[PDB]
Amino acid sequence: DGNKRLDAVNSIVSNASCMVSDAVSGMICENPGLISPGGNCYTNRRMAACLRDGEIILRYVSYALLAGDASVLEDRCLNGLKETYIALGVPTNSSIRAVSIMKAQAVAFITNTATERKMSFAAGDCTSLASEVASYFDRVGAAIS
């Protein structure tokens, strides 16, 4: 099934920029306090750091999908992250919402069910891969909750 996995990874990386900006924008429009003074996305420096973290997390999750194993994500990205976010004051509940939106996006691209962009595949089923990538995204929340 390895060709399907390569397609699934390609579908994510090819839309990775739009995924990150739309997820972090979504987290904000649901909780606009994040943008008020004292909010953790207030100022360009913070919004850039948050966008950066979105991308990093997606980058790790895409490796895990390309490897068929969560270790790279857990070892290199998730280990330490909860403590870091606590120490920084990065809200972990808002982080988990950003990640959940990227989960919905990746499931859509993998199964070619995005509303705004179709890509090109031979007919078949990728539900296992979509369920797998979901489990990687869910490990993020699990780590930082």
């Binding site: 390569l6 990874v9 990386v13 991308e55 990093i56 980058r59 790790y60 895409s62 490796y63 390309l66 290199r76 990205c77």
Partner: peptide, 27 residues
Amino acid sequence: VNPRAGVRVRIKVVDNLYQVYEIPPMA
């Protein structure tokens, strides 16, 4: 370790022939 890095994978097709899959370094 560094998440900004690219990724390179090597697939054997036959002895002395490979398919190369790349993820570019982050912008």
